[PDB]
Amino acid sequence: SILDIRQGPKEPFRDYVDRFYKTLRAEQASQEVKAWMTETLLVQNANPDCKTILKALGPGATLEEMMTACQGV
Amino acid sequence: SILDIRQGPKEPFRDYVDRFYKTLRAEQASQEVKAWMTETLLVQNANPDCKTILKALGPGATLEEMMTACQGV
């Protein structure tokens, strides 16, 4: 179900982040779960440009770092 | 890093499942985290045939159900 939150082709990373986490909240994801989700699903469900950038940034990036790198698109 | 465990184009689903959870163990994934990973990342990191079968099965399938559906192809 978070499986079905994928980033629109032109959607700004930031808007995709609100839906991702919004969906996570509804499902009462624990804090530990959000942290793992940030590093995995958030990346794999990003659009092809963001996905490439996030993979290039690598594991253990913070969300803020994820966003700075995906500003612009 | 568990993000780097993708299923081979002809790997039996079952061998992909050992690597997935093997990798999760090394990173001391909690029980709650294995449950969420089972339903998300394990699915998206499966090969195109298993991926399609798992998505068709849907959220909240058990691992055994996932494996029965992916025996063969």
From TrEMBL, chains A, B:
Subcellular location: Host cell membrane; Host endosome, Host multivesicular body; Virion membrane; Virion
Disulfide bonds: 50-70
Subunit structure, as described in the record: Homotrimer; further assembles as hexamers of trimers. Interacts with gp41 (via C-terminus). Interacts with host CALM1; this interaction induces a conformational change in the Matrix protein, triggering exposure of the myristate group. Interacts with host AP3D1; this interaction allows the polyprotein trafficking to multivesicular bodies during virus assembly. Part of the pre-integration complex (PIC) which is composed of viral genome, matrix protein, Vpr and integrase.
Family affiliation: Belongs to the primate lentivirus group gag polyprotein family.
UniProt protein name: Gag polyprotein
Species this protein is from: Human immunodeficiency virus type 1
Included range, full protein: 281 to 353 of 500
